[PDB]
């Protein structure tokens, strides 16, 4: 996809997040698990349901074929008649197919732009208190329990609070020992 997240730096999706489209996998001393991002999954549901209704709704009025019968010396407008009704049947078929196709692309790059936007939400919260691994995961320079994992999830995460324990643990790895 256009934003390089889906089938990109996060290669593969998680079979186990059965309660959302986008989300988290926390991992501390207490254990690990799946937690779905509550708000962005809803933000995508609304954009897609609004889109689906807008496509059906746009084809609200559309050409309606009518039966007309013409006699033997009315051959000309008989034909005029036909090329016309067909004429219109074609225009609206082109419009339906080409619209679905176009908004299929835009549906996918919405999901893609969203994953890449949740990853950069976390990235600018933590900064150097964690190490960016490159596979879409973050490894902390400090100790983070389950109510701390929650502070990153709902956006509460406090940087100055853990920043001292992180910068002293960064200093330990600079030395090598």
């Amino acid at each position: 996809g256009l934003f390089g997240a889906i089938a990109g730096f996060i290669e593969g999706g998680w079979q186990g997040m059965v309660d959302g489209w986008y989300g988290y996998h926390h991992s501390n001393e207490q254990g690990s698990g799946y937690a779905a991002d509550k708000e962005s999954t809803q933000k995508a549901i609304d954009g897609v349901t609004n889109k689906v209704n807008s496509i059906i709704d746009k084809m609200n009025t559309q050409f309606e074929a009518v039966g007309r019968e013409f006699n033997n010396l009315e051959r000309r407008i008989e034909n005029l008649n036909k090329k016309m009704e067909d004429g219109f049947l074609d225009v609206w078929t082109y419009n339906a197919e080409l619209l679905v196709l176009m908004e299929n692309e835009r549906t996918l790059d919405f999901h893609d732009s969203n994953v890449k936007n949740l990853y950069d939400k976390v990235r600018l919260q933590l900064r150097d208190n964690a190490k960016e691994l490159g596979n879409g995961c973050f490894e902390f320079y400090h100790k983070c329990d389950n109510e701390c994992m929650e502070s990153v999830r709902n956006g509460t995460y406090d940087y100055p609070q853990y920043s001292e324990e992180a910068r002293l643990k960064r200093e330990e790895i600079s030395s090598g020992r």
């Binding site: 489209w21 986008y22 009518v66 039966g67 019968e69 339906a96 299929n104």
Partner: protein
């Protein structure tokens, strides 16, 4: 040693739905939504409440003039839409022409009910022969007969005195009225049937001004006959009167039609017969019962229907891309 971790990822599952995109075809995704209805039920149904008028081997013309072979339709109930086959067999049994017939079929598409009424009693033809007017072109059951709603008058004793008959539409609805002229093969035939050699049919309304004359000619045999019948029609406005005067070759009316419920309807060309069901959507191919916004069964549908398109596939992608 592993330091604590947090990961960001997206949904995946066991879905094999495929969509298309401007750049990629058959992309498997998490969730999809089809919007095209492709299935119908192959039958002709009632429409909500209403059973369609299904002419079997009849045509709209055969019905209205009353072809003997059409008696199944002598007094129909109210309908939702008429179904006529593509090449009906029982049309004008005695060969000729039905004037401005397509335009009339057009009127029928907004009519839901008739009421046949007598406007000139067949018994009333006291000084002519109503009862000889019968042809082998027009057979009941090997019995040769005639159209039923019109009457082929013929000379009585030796003479055919001048006909003057009129009917004043005193109902509050419009009257569809029909009549016609008979064109013989030669002078000999003309004088045998109607005695008078030079003849006419005059017909008046507040809007009609018509004077018809027979057209003697030598023609190919059609159904064993060389003569022809030519039929005509008008809407007789409420409280208006129609007056016939003639002198020979007159096919007079007896019964007429009061246009008595108007509304949505169509004439549906379809080979099918009555399917004993019910829909909210009917197609000349069979009925549809669906919530889909789109179908591709047939462009000419009647009732509350999805919008026709010509595609064999319209599927939306709603969910997200499924793992490579």
């Amino acid at each position: 040693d592993p330091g604590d971790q947090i990961c960001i990822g997206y949904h995946a599952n066991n879905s094999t739905e495929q969509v298309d995109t401007i750049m990629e075809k058959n992309v498997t995704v998490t969730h999809a939504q089809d919007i095209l209805e492709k299935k119908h039920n192959g039958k002709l149904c009632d429409l909500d409440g209403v059973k369609p008028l299904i002419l079997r081997d009849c045509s709209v013309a055969g019905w209205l003039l009353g072809n003997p072979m059409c008696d199944e339709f002598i007094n129909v109930p109210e309908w939702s839409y008429i179904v006529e086959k593509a090449n009906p067999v029982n049309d004008l049994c005695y060969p000729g022409d039905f004037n401005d017939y397509e335009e009339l079929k057009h009127l029928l598409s907004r009519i839901n009910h008739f009421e046949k009424i007598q406007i000139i009693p067949k018994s009333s033809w006291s000084s002519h022969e109503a009862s000889l007017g019968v042809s082998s072109a027009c057979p009941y059951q090997g019995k040769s007969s005639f159209f039923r709603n019109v009457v082929w008058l013929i000379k009585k004793d030796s003479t055919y005195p001048t006909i003057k008959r009129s009917y004043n539409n005193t109902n509050q609805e419009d009257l569809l009225v029909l009549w016609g002229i008979h064109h013989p093969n030669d002078a000999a035939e003309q004088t045998k049937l109607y005695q008078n050699p030079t003849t006419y049919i005059s017909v008046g309304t507040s809007t009609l001004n018509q004077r018809l004359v027979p057209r003697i000619a030598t023609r190919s045999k059609v159904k064993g006959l060389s003569g022809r019948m030519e039929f005509f029609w008008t809407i007789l406005k409420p409280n208006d009167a129609i007056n016939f005067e003639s002198n020979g070759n007159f096919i007079a009316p007896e019964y007429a039609y009061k246009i008595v419920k108007k509304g949505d309807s169509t004439i549906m060309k379809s080979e099918l017969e009555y399917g004993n069901c019910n829909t909210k959507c009917q197609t000349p191919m069979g009925a549809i019962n669906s919530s889909m916004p789109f179908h591709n069964i047939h462009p000419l549908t009647i009732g509350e229907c999805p919008k026709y398109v010509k595609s064999n596939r319209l599927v939306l992608a709603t969910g997200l891309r499924n793992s490579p």
